[model samples]
Target: MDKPLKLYFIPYLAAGHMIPLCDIAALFASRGHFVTIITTPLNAKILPKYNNFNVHTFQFPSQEVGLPEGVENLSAVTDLDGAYKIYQAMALLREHIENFVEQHPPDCIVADFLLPWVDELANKLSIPRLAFNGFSLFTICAMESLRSHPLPEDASGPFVIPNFPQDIVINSTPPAESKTFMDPLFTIALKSNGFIINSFVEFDGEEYVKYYEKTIGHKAWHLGPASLVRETIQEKAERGEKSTLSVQKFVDWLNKKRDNSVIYISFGTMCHFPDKQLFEIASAIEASGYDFIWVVPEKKGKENESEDDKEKWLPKGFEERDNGMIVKGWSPQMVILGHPAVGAFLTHCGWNSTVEAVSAGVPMITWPVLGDQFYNEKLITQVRGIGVEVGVDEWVVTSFRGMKQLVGRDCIEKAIRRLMDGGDEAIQIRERSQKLAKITKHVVQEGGSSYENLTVLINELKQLRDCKVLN
Candidate 1:
C-alpha cells in the first residue's frame, strides 16, 4: 500500500462488458493500486465515477466500429453487430495501446476476452497480459461440446451435444464423471495471459476450479463476481453519483419492490428479440400474473424507422399497469438486481448476468439465447439444480429463434409461491442462493480469490518496472 501498483485495463465497447470491466478496475484501484482504463468516449460517458485511478479515452475514427453501419446508436444493434464492432474496435485499439505502453508505460495489462489481440501486444512489449472469460464453467463445456468430441475451433450455432458424463461416451482431456468437464483446447487459448473467470471457487467449487486448471492452469485465477467486489469498494469511495427519481424513475420502482416476489428479466447488454418472440414473451409475462420488471433496451437491428416506432414494440397495455414496469432505455442493472425485491431473475445467461444473479441470490428462469448462454443454462438448471430451465422441445426449437416460451404461468406461479410464501423446494433454493451470495461477498474481501488475483497481477506489473522490457 506504499505507492500503488500501476495496472492498465481495456474492455470491449458494449455496456454489458464495459460496466463489469470498469468494476474490476475500480476494485484494484480501491485496494491501493493505481488503475488505468483504456476505453472509448461512449463508455466514459456512462461510467462517470473513477476514484483513485486514471481513465484514458482513446480516440477512434468512429464509434461505428462496434455497431452496425446502418444502425443509429449502439443500443439498436443485434448482439452480432455488437460483437462485430467489438473485435473491429479492439483490433484498432491494439495500435493505440502499443504506442501508449511505449510512451507512458504501465506495470501490467489486463483486458476482456473479446479483445484477443492482447496476447500479441503483451508479447511485443514483453509485458504480462491477462485474458479473461466472464462466464461460468458449464458454458465453456457446452460450447466446445467437450463431452462428446474435440471442441470446434470457433463455436457457432445450436448443436445439441451432451456436456455431462451421460451425454458423451468419451472426453479427450479427462473423464466427465471424474469431475473433469472442460476441453484441453480451451487451455491453449488461455496461456501466458492470467485467465479470469467471473466466478468464485466456493459456489462453482470443483466446476470452476476444474475448468480453471484445465484451461488456464497456474496462470488462471477465479476472483469472480467481480462486479460486486467493485460495488463494495465503490460504496467506500462513494464513486457513482446518486440520481434523482424523476431522472431514474424506472430503477426507483424496482428498489421499492419486495424480495423474491418480483422477477428481473433482461437479455443482457446486447440480446434483441425478433418481433415474433418479443410478443410471445409479453404474453407469457401477462400469463404469469406475478409482479414483473423487464429492461427492454431498444432492439436496434438493421431496421430504420419513423419517430412513432418506439411505443408499438411493447404490449399495448403494459405501460398502463400499476404493478408491471418496462424500461425503454438503460437502467442501473447491478443496483436494481442487488435490491431485496428481486426474487427470481429471467436471464439470457450472459456471464455478467450469471455472476450478478449469484451475487444477488436470485434464482433464474433460464432462457439461453446465443453464445455461451446455453452452456450457462446447463450449469444453473442442470448442475446447480437451483432453478427450472424452461422449455420443452417445441419451446427449445422456438428459443433458437430468440426465446423459448417463458417458464409457463403454472411453474412461475409455483416459483413465486416458494419465494414469497415458502415451501421446501423454495427454501432449498433460497438457502443455496444465500450461501452463494455469501461466497460472492467473501471473494471480494481481503485475501479472497479476486483479491489474490489482483495481487498476482499487480506483482507482475510491479516487477516489469525494473526490467527494461518495452522499447
Candidate 2:
C-alpha cells in the first residue's frame, strides 16, 4: 500500500454539487489521502465533517458565483454568468492554488468539468485535474451529437435520430408524445483533463462502457456513485454539523403513517415556482389528501422585514395552507428524502435530490424547473422510470389542459395514491427504484465498480504524489 494522493476538488457551489463533492471527499479521506474542497462560503455549509479533507472557501470579495438573484449570504460569492465567466475567475483562483501549492501542493485535482480554468491550474502545478461530470454518457453523446443542431429534433419530434450510435442514452421517459433531449453541457465538458462519470458499472454498466469507448475511447473514468460510499465513511464525523434539511419533523410525522404511505415534495434550493406553478404544486399537495411533506421556501417576505431592509418572492396569503400539508420553509432534505414513509419524491430532478431519492428507494414526480433539471426530468422519466413529469408550463395557468393537469389537491391525491398504494404500477416501479438504490450501494463496496475504480485512480494518483515529496 503506497501513500495516498493529495486530492483537491472545486465544484460549482450548490447543495446538488456540494453533497456529491463532499461525498467524494469522504471517499478519498477514508482511504488515508488528504482531500480538500475549495468552494465559496455559502456552500461550505454542506461539507462532510471529517478530518481527512479541508474546505477553504475562496472569496476575493469582488468575485461572485452563479446563484439565484437576490440570494445572498455573507460568505457566498456569485459567478453570475455560467461557464461564460469561468475563465477569468479561474485565472484568479489559479493564482490562489499556486499559493496553496507553495505550502501544500496537491498531487491532483478532481474538478467539475465546466471548471476548465482549473485544468490549466492543475497543469501549471504539474498535476492531474480529473474532470467530474454528473450526467449519463448517452446524454453526453446525444448533446455532443448536436454541435451542429442544438434544438430538439422536432418542436414535438419524431425525436428519432433515425441513426444514432450505441452510446446514446435515448430519452426513455417520454409522454405519449415526447421530444428528443440532449445533455446540454456536453460541449463544455470536452476540455476536461479526463472525464469522470458518476454511474456504477452494474447500474449503468453497458452505458458506462459504451461512453468509455466514445470519441474513440478517449481517456475517461467510470468511478460511479460517490454518495453512498461517502456516507458510511463520514457518518460519525458529520453528526453534529447543521443540516440544510433535516427529517426530524418529517420522520416523526412519517412514523405515524403506514409503511410507504407518504409523498415527499422538494424542489431544491435553486428551484422557484412562478405563481402559476407554485399554486399548482400547492393545490396538488392539498388535493392528494395523502400523508405528505411538501418542502417550499416560504421566504419571510416584505412585511416580515424589519422596516430597515426588504427582499421579495413570496405569494401573499400562502400562509393559508389547504389544511393538509406538512409545509416547511426550509428542511433537512437528506433525512427527509431517506425516511421510510417517503414513498415517493416530488422534485425538480436536481441530481442531488435525484441521488438521495434513488438511494432511499423513493420514486418521484419530476417537475423540471430549469437548466439541467429538464434533462434530469427526462432521465428520471426515461431511464429510471421512477417518476412522471409534471407538465404544466412555467408561465401557464393553474389548469392542466382545461383543469386536468393542475397540481391541485385532486391531482396530488391521485399521484400519491398511484405511488404509495402498491396497487398498480407502484410495486414494480418501487422495486426498480430500490434496485437502483441497491446497485448504488454495491458500487461503493470493496469489490464494486466505484470502489475498485477509486482504488485504481488513487493508486495512479499516489504515484504522482510520491514523486513530489518535500525536499
Candidate 3:
C-alpha cells in the first residue's frame, strides 16, 4: 500500500449528519489511513472512539451568540430562532477550522454538505475537497431537477419529473428555504473534487445516476448504505454508552413478539413535534393495535407541559394500556430494526434512519416533515416501492428546519395497518424492501459496488500523497 494519506472529516452537528460521517471516518481509519474528525466539543464527545482516528474539538461560542449552554447542536433546539443561533454559532468555526487546517494540512478534506466554505478553503490550500452526502443519487437528481425545472410561481399540481420513475404531486412548497441555504453549497459541490455518497447505484435506478451526471453536472462516487459496512449502534451497545437499561429492556420485550409483527416509530433526533401532532400520533399508534417500539425525544412535550411532565408527551395511559414500548432519549435503533419482529418503520425519513431501515429489510411508512426527507419519501414510496406515505401535505413549520405537520390520527392509523398487514400490496412492498436489504449488504461485501468504490477513493488519496512525496 502507498503511504497512509492523512484525511480530515468535518461534519455538521446533527446526529443524522454526524453518524454517517462517523462511518465514513471509521471506514478510512480502518483501512490504515490517518483520519482526523473536527467538530464542536459537545459533538466530539458523542462520536465513537477509533484507533486510527482522532477527535479535535473547537468550542462552540454559544454564550457569545446568546444561545444557552450545551445548545450547540441543531437537535438540541426546537424552534427556528434557536436553530438559527446554532447555525450562527457554526459560522464562527470557519476561522478556527481554517487556523487548524493551515497549521496541519491533510491530503484531502471530506466535508458535510452544509459546510460550503470548505471548497474555498481546500482550493486555497490546493487540497482535494469531497462533499459527503447521506441521501441517495435518486433524491439528489430529483432535487436538482426541481432546481433546474423551476415551477411557475403558483404551480401546485401532479406533474411528471423528468427521468423520475413515478409522477408526484407538488403537495407543498419544495424546501425553498433549504434551497436558499444550500445554493452556495451546491455550487461549491459541483465545483468540488468529487462526492462521497452513502448509497449504491443498484439501490436507486441507474437511470437517475446517469441523469445526475448528465444534467446536474456532478459525478458522485456512490458506495454505501454504509450501515452494511459499519454497524454503529451495535458498536455503541458493545461499548456500553449512549444506551440505557430501558433500551435493552425494550429489546427483551421485542423478543416475545411474533415475526414481522412490530412497527418501529421514530422521527429521528432532529424533529420536535408540537403537542397537537404528538397526541395525534399517540391516538394513531394506540388505534393501530400493532406491537411497536417508539423513540420519543427526551425533551419533546406540549407548550404547556412543564419540565416535570416533559416525559409524559404521549397520550396519558397509552404506554401502560397499549402493546408497545417507549424509549426516551437515545435508543439503539439498528438493534431493534434488525430484530426479526420489526415489520415496518414509521419514520420521518431522515437519510440515516431511512438507510438503516432499508439495511434492516423493514418496509417504511414515510412521513417526511423537512429537509431532504420529503425527497426521500418520494424515493421510497414512489421510485423504490419500499414505503408508504402518511398523507402530510405541507411542512407545518419551516422556520427552524423542523417537520411538524398535523398528519391526523386517521391517516396515521390507515398507513400503519396498510404497511403492517395489508394484503397483496403490502406483501409486494415487503418483498422489494427485503431485496433492497440484500443489495445493501452485497454492495459492501467483496467485489461489491461500495467495496470497490471505497478502494478507489482510498487509492486516489494515497496516489495524491505518494506523488507529493516523489516531487
Q: Output the worst ten-in-a-row residue range by lDDT, candidate 2.
A: 395-404
Q: Where is model 1 more than 4 Å wrong at Cα?
A: 1-3, 48-51, 63-87, 141-148, 151-188, 214-218, 230-257, 299-316, 392-423, 460-471
Tens digits of per-residue lDDT, candidate 3, 1-471, equal 746778999988777777788777777787788899998877777566767889888888978778878677777777777767877887888889989998999999999878888888898888888898677777777777767776666754344565554566534556456667656667778888788888888877788777777777777887677656446545734321265445567668888889889999998777767656777888898888888887767443333455446434567666558688766556777788899999999998888888888888999998877677777887788778998888776753462434444568999999999988766999999999999988887787778887888899888877777776787
Per-residue accuracy of model 1 over 1-471 as CA lDDT, tens digit each: 345667788876655566666777777777777788887665565454556777887765355464433332234445554555655766777788778866866667877666666667777777777765566544554444444454355533334454443242211222132123233334444655566666766656565456446643444566677676544423422222222123346546766766566777787766666665565566667666667777765443313443355335546665466567665545456666777877788777778878878887887777655555666666666566556555422212212234543434455444444444556776787788777787777777887776786677666656666564443
- Rank all candidate structures by their lDDT, best first, as comma-separated numbers: 3, 1, 2
C-alpha-based local distance difference test score of model 2: 0.58
**lDDT tens digits, residues 216-324, model 2?**
3455666656656545423522322343344454555667777777788876655444445456565556556666676655332323443222112223343454333
Q: For candidate 1, give the lDDT of residue 213.
A: 60
- Whole-model alpha-carbon lDDT for candidate 1: 0.60
TM-score of each: 0.77, 0.77, 0.91
Q: What number of backbone clashes does candidate 2 have, counting pairs of residues 3 or more apart or in separate chains? A: 24
Residue pairs with backbone overlap in model 3: 80-400
**Ten contiguous residues minimizing lDDT sum, candidate 3:** 236-245
Clashes of each: 11, 24, 1
| Number of the top-ranking candidate, with TM-score as the measure | 3
